[PDB]
Every structure is written in C-alpha cells, then in structure tokens.
C-alpha cells in the first residue's frame, strides 16, 4: 500500500476516513476496525488518484490542501462517497480530462487557493 495510514492528503488520511466510516462507534470491535482499516485504504487511494488529477487540470483550486472534501457525499451515511462512484469520477476525468461533467462539479465544490 502506497500511503502511511497517517499520511495526508487533500486533508484526508487513511486513519480520518476510517474514523468516518467507524461514525458513532466509539468503542469498536477487532472485526470492524479491520473492516473499516480496508474500506478506508481503498477510498484513500482512490481519493489520491483524483485529487492529484485535479490539482493539474484546476491549478486554482487547492486540490493537494482541501480536495477531499470535495469528495465527501451529503448524502450517505458516514459522509464519503461510494467506493464504485469514485472509480466512475476517476474514469469521467482520465477520459475527457478538462471536458468532464466531474471536472466541472469537482471545480464548483473545492476550496480555491484564492
């Protein structure tokens, strides 16, 4: 795995998103912070994957510093998006770059440098 689980990134870690995923369960099981630990290692490193994508395509926004909370999702449970909605993000953006609907959603969500 690429990242430290510390590591941040966009403002998000491995061990952040895990704490989102674990929500209101302050006294976790062994067996739901493993499950928890794996989710929150593949959103991360998808979420990486964006983030770095975007940090290019919108040099405006600060995509290394705040773009992981362009990617939350008001409407889930615990706040992060679903794990095969970021694949299609990512595939939206690495096939039309610049003239993806994503760029342009990602654009109008993001903290701007200025």
Same mark, same amino acid.
């Given at each position: 795995? @690429? ?17 989102? %995923? ?14 928890? !630990? ?7 490193? /998808?979420?990486?994957?964006?983030? !770095? ?10 995509w290394m510093g705040?773009?992981? !909370?362009? %990617? +939350?999702? @008001? ?6 998006? +679903? %794990?095969? !909605? /970021?694949?299609?993000? /990512?595939? +939206? ?12 959603? %990602? ?8």
């Open positions: 795995y @690429p990242y430290p689980v510390d590591e941040i990134i966009g403002g998000d870690s491995v061990q952040s998103i895990q704490r989102r %995923l674990l929500g209101t369960n302050w006294n976790p099981s062994a067996h739901d912070m493993q499950m928890s !630990r794996i989710q929150a290692e593949d959103l991360f490193e /998808l979420k990486v994957e964006i983030i !770095r994508k975007m940090a290019g395509l919108h040099p405006s926004g600060d705040w773009g992981a !909370r362009a %990617l +939350d999702n @008001p409407r889930t449970a615990t706040g992060e998006e +679903d %794990l095969a !909605r /970021l694949h299609q993000m /990512l595939d +939206d953006l690495q096939s039309r770059n610049e003239q993806s609907a994503t760029f342009w959603r %990602l654009v109008e969500r993001v903290r701007l440098r200025a």
